[PDB]
Design a protein around this ligand. Sequence first.
Ligand SMILES: [Mg+2]
Ligand SMILES: [Mg+2]
Ligand SMILES: [Mg+2]
Ligand SMILES: [Mg+2]
Ligand SMILES: [Mg+2]
Ligand SMILES: [Mg+2]
Ligand SMILES: [Mg+2]
Ligand SMILES: [Mg+2]
Ligand SMILES: [Mg+2]
Ligand SMILES: [Mg+2]
Ligand SMILES: [Mg+2]
Ligand SMILES: [Mg+2]
Ligand SMILES: [Mg+2]
Ligand SMILES: [Mg+2]
Ligand SMILES: [Mg+2]
Ligand SMILES: [Mg+2]
Ligand SMILES: [Mg+2]
Ligand SMILES: [Mg+2]
Ligand SMILES: [Mg+2]
Ligand SMILES: [Mg+2]
Ligand SMILES: [Mg+2]
Ligand SMILES: [Mg+2]
Ligand SMILES: [Mg+2]
Ligand SMILES: [Mg+2]
Ligand SMILES: [Mg+2]
Ligand SMILES: [Mg+2]
Ligand SMILES: [Mg+2]
Ligand SMILES: [Mg+2]
Ligand SMILES: [Mg+2]
Ligand SMILES: [Mg+2]
Ligand SMILES: [Mg+2]
Ligand SMILES: [Mg+2]
Ligand SMILES: [Mg+2]
Ligand SMILES: [Mg+2]
Ligand SMILES: [Mg+2]
Ligand SMILES: [Mg+2]
Ligand SMILES: [Mg+2]
Ligand SMILES: [Mg+2]
Ligand SMILES: [Mg+2]
Ligand SMILES: [Mg+2]
Ligand SMILES: [Mg+2]
Ligand SMILES: [Mg+2]
Ligand SMILES: [Mg+2]
Ligand SMILES: [Mg+2]
Ligand SMILES: [Mg+2]
Ligand SMILES: [Mg+2]
Ligand SMILES: [Mg+2]
Ligand SMILES: [Mg+2]
Ligand SMILES: [Mg+2]
Ligand SMILES: [Mg+2]
Ligand SMILES: [Mg+2]
Ligand SMILES: [Mg+2]
Ligand SMILES: [Mg+2]
Ligand SMILES: [Mg+2]
Ligand SMILES: [Mg+2]
Ligand SMILES: [Mg+2]
Ligand SMILES: [Mg+2]
Ligand SMILES: [Mg+2]
Ligand SMILES: [Mg+2]
Ligand SMILES: [Mg+2]
Ligand SMILES: [Mg+2]
Ligand SMILES: [Mg+2]
Ligand SMILES: [Mg+2]
Ligand SMILES: [Mg+2]
Ligand SMILES: [Mg+2]
Ligand SMILES: [Mg+2]
Ligand SMILES: [Mg+2]
Ligand SMILES: [Mg+2]
Ligand SMILES: [Mg+2]
Ligand SMILES: [Mg+2]
Ligand SMILES: [Mg+2]
Lengths: 114, 88, 68, 275, 100
Amino acid sequence: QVASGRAYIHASYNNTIVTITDPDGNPITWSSGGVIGYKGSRKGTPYAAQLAALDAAKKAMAYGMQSVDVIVRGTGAGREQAIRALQASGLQVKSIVDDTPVPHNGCRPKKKFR
Amino acid sequence: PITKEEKQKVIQEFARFPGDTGSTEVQVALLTLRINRLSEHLKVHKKDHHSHRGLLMMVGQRRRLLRYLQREDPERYRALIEKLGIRG
Amino acid sequence: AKVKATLGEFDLRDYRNVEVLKRFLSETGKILPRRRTGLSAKEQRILAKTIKRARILGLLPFTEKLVR
Amino acid sequence: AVKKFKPYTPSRRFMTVADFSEITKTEPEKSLVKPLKKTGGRNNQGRITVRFRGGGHKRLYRIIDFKRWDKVGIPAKVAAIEYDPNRSARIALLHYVDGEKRYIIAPDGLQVGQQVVAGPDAPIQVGNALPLRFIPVGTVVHAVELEPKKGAKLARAAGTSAQIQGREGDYVILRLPSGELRKVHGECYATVGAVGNADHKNIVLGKAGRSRWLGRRPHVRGAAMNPVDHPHGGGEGRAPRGRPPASPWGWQTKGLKTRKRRKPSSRFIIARRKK
Amino acid sequence: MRRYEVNIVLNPNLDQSQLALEKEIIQRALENYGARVEKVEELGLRRLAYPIAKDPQGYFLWYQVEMPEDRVNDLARELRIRDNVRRVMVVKSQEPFLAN
RNA sequence: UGGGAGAGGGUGGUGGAAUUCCCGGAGUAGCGGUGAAAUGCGCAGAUACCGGGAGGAACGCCGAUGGCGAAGGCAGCCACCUGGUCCACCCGUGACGCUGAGGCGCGAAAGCGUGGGGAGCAAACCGGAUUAGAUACCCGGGUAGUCCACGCCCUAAACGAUGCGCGCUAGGUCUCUGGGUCUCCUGGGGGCCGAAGCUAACGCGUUAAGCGCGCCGCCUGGGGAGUACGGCCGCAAGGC
Ligand SMILES: [Mg+2]
Ligand SMILES: [Mg+2]
Ligand SMILES: [Mg+2]
Ligand SMILES: [Mg+2]
Ligand SMILES: [Mg+2]
Ligand SMILES: [Mg+2]
Ligand SMILES: [Mg+2]
Ligand SMILES: [Mg+2]
Ligand SMILES: [Mg+2]
Ligand SMILES: [Mg+2]
Ligand SMILES: [Mg+2]
Ligand SMILES: [Mg+2]
Ligand SMILES: [Mg+2]
Ligand SMILES: [Mg+2]
Ligand SMILES: [Mg+2]
Ligand SMILES: [Mg+2]
Ligand SMILES: [Mg+2]
Ligand SMILES: [Mg+2]
Ligand SMILES: [Mg+2]
Ligand SMILES: [Mg+2]
Ligand SMILES: [Mg+2]
Ligand SMILES: [Mg+2]
Ligand SMILES: [Mg+2]
Ligand SMILES: [Mg+2]
Ligand SMILES: [Mg+2]
Ligand SMILES: [Mg+2]
Ligand SMILES: [Mg+2]
Ligand SMILES: [Mg+2]
Ligand SMILES: [Mg+2]
Ligand SMILES: [Mg+2]
Ligand SMILES: [Mg+2]
Ligand SMILES: [Mg+2]
Ligand SMILES: [Mg+2]
Ligand SMILES: [Mg+2]
Ligand SMILES: [Mg+2]
Ligand SMILES: [Mg+2]
Ligand SMILES: [Mg+2]
Ligand SMILES: [Mg+2]
Ligand SMILES: [Mg+2]
Ligand SMILES: [Mg+2]
Ligand SMILES: [Mg+2]
Ligand SMILES: [Mg+2]
Ligand SMILES: [Mg+2]
Ligand SMILES: [Mg+2]
Ligand SMILES: [Mg+2]
Ligand SMILES: [Mg+2]
Ligand SMILES: [Mg+2]
Ligand SMILES: [Mg+2]
Ligand SMILES: [Mg+2]
Ligand SMILES: [Mg+2]
Ligand SMILES: [Mg+2]
Ligand SMILES: [Mg+2]
Ligand SMILES: [Mg+2]
Ligand SMILES: [Mg+2]
Ligand SMILES: [Mg+2]
Ligand SMILES: [Mg+2]
Ligand SMILES: [Mg+2]
Ligand SMILES: [Mg+2]
Ligand SMILES: [Mg+2]
Ligand SMILES: [Mg+2]
Ligand SMILES: [Mg+2]
Ligand SMILES: [Mg+2]
Ligand SMILES: [Mg+2]
Ligand SMILES: [Mg+2]
Ligand SMILES: [Mg+2]
Ligand SMILES: [Mg+2]
Ligand SMILES: [Mg+2]
Ligand SMILES: [Mg+2]
Ligand SMILES: [Mg+2]
Ligand SMILES: [Mg+2]
Ligand SMILES: [Mg+2]
């Protein structure tokens, strides 16, 4: 195991997926609106992300994980809840940094996003 | 482009008198000089239609001047066009 | 707070002036608006053209992460 | 730029001919031609082993320099570009400052009067040959040796080229004309640029006789034959295939792969071809 | 003839004498394409704003030169051939433009 | 003559972001998607995370109510080639002008021919929903095509639904770009509000839709019909 690693929050309008990694970015454990038995729209709610992070942090802590640099991608409804969840779990959140992908005008969006 | 040196040669070689910068003769030679470097530019860049509009304007412009000099002096007219090789 | 005021005389065509230029970028690497830059219409176009060069030369960033 | 014909015969409607406008010399170097034994697709038993061959125009073979590492360091001048009836590419005649005269495949954009040279130090320049390990990544290359010193084997047909994509130890990664990605040894030679005469594919033979000039005798469909001849033979009236479409010899011919599976070059084929 | 600034970044992890062979090639290329060197500002190693060829830094050359306009494109290309030349940006020399 | 601003056009290069695919690592029970679902994908190891590679397209911030062009239209950055245009000096020619039936060139998208390219997107098409139906909207897929080169097609709410040139008739405000003596004065553009006046009204108003002159295009009730016949053009679609 390792003392400290990172924490990645992928959160869209449909779901929030949390994955804990190590220093080198390789994953240690993950969770999401599905791992806490939510199916469908319920997966995108802030409570869903809360449980998802808490389950993701708990699994990580049970691997010796102590500290986390928080990396957030997406604009989902459960984004800002998931961040609160990480600190409140017992993990020592060192930093929080947004890394959401944004095209410098790349590929044509699906009709739904124009 | 066209350097001021080459530009002064056409003014020199066509000025009706040392000092003349806007007579019909030096105007046509100045235009013929633009027209020909552009005619050669559009032989390479055939897709450059915007510059071709400018080519057409210079062409019409030179034609109107030559219509004026041929009304005043058909001897100044013939002499100028043979020194520039026009009329096809 | 305006950048142009907080800076003495400078050449906004020198693209190698990372020290002057890096002050015109946001915390995330974006070319600042005029409401932050204090440059005019003519100055801002020239600034942007030179910032853009330095980004290509690797002297300036295209984009940075947001830290909180 | 292929040349066309007015429809003054039924066949001239469609016939196109190469323009030949790059050719500077119209009879071959006498010291570099030899007789080309026509075969008619017959082997040494006398049996047809490749159907529908023969009857084409007489040809002299032109000896082509497919090594070039023969003469490392010796600049040659491009003396002429010539027609070669044995390949799709044109060929270029080099006058080496040695005095030696050789033919190579004429790459695209090569000009009479320029100089080419072979070797590790050769300028990255159309017509120069280098070992693949010294050609910078991304360079379009042709006449490529497939194993070091065994001779240029790849990309020799008119218009083709291979693109260098990366390196890996002694080997380079090529994208072949087929679109396959393959490891080829770094010490293998290749020539900068693509093969010329790229318009070759746009020629429209235009009439049956033109195929006969090339040695191509008519091809007869299996569905035109009788059962003794062919899987598709026979039947009253016309007939669909009535079985998976087959060759004369009975193997399937729509998709049945035929590369040998346990072939050692498999360790070097990264990606099969495309399209 | 027109004045241009030729910016060049090199492989930062070379030795000093390999670096010299690269500059010698640059110098000959400059010389062969009709360039007239006037200045030379060689700041060398500089950490970059982003990785270039998986390298956080690169060796920065710079030449204020004068050359015939019809050749700068070929020159800038011939410079790009060597793989250690990771960036080349020729730029028309301009009179400064100043604020304050 | 000397200056200037600009996504004006053409060619050759080249930079980063992102999506997709591929290889390696780490990792496991779902992911995706919706109004809610399902199809779909996923223990044959997906999603989410990291390293690597290939390839196409489009250029975030700057960026604007902005700029340029005759219009269509033009937006990373570098160089070459090329057009238009404005301003200062008042130096040259001496009415050389304006418009313009025909003609000729340019002409968004889509479409067409021949090669090439193909990541994303997506007519057609297939599937999942919804519904009485659902040949739709919503979802998961997906072929042309979107991209490049050359050659065609020549259409449009091709709009300011406002032809071009010139002269004349209050100003206020904002902005782009020049020049000066740098409050400001003065040019050339781009908007707003308004004098007089115009208008059926809405509205227009020194960017006229005001007052005038020149020349061109065009209208003459609706439907039939931009159809038919004829002619010309086009590979076709179809255009005039
Ligand atoms: Mg959901
Ligand atoms: Mg400078
Ligand atoms: Mg023909
Ligand atoms: Mg005919
Ligand atoms: Mg030929
Ligand atoms: Mg003999
Ligand atoms: Mg034989
Ligand atoms: Mg025998
Ligand atoms: Mg026998
Ligand atoms: Mg025998
Ligand atoms: Mg056979
Ligand atoms: Mg035979
Ligand atoms: Mg040949
Ligand atoms: Mg052959
Ligand atoms: Mg090999
Ligand atoms: Mg054919
Ligand atoms: Mg033959
Ligand atoms: Mg055949
Ligand atoms: Mg047959
Ligand atoms: Mg039969
Ligand atoms: Mg029969
Ligand atoms: Mg028999
Ligand atoms: Mg039998
Ligand atoms: Mg039998
Ligand atoms: Mg038999
Ligand atoms: Mg049989
Ligand atoms: Mg049969
Ligand atoms: Mg029979
Ligand atoms: Mg039959
Ligand atoms: Mg029958
Ligand atoms: Mg029969
Ligand atoms: Mg059957
Ligand atoms: Mg069979
Ligand atoms: Mg077999
Ligand atoms: Mg293959
Ligand atoms: Mg290089
Ligand atoms: Mg001037
Ligand atoms: Mg994997
Ligand atoms: Mg299933
Ligand atoms: Mg298993
Ligand atoms: Mg690809
Ligand atoms: Mg005067
Ligand atoms: Mg006078
Ligand atoms: Mg069109
Ligand atoms: Mg189109
Ligand atoms: Mg097409
Ligand atoms: Mg596709
Ligand atoms: Mg269905
Ligand atoms: Mg449906
Ligand atoms: Mg129902
Ligand atoms: Mg039903
Ligand atoms: Mg769809
Ligand atoms: Mg899709
Ligand atoms: Mg696909
Ligand atoms: Mg409009
Ligand atoms: Mg109209
Ligand atoms: Mg009109
Ligand atoms: Mg305008
Ligand atoms: Mg105004
Ligand atoms: Mg009134
Ligand atoms: Mg009236
Ligand atoms: Mg009113
Ligand atoms: Mg009003
Ligand atoms: Mg008004
Ligand atoms: Mg006004
Ligand atoms: Mg009518
Ligand atoms: Mg009518
Ligand atoms: Mg119509
Ligand atoms: Mg009609
Ligand atoms: Mg008709
Ligand atoms: Mg009409």
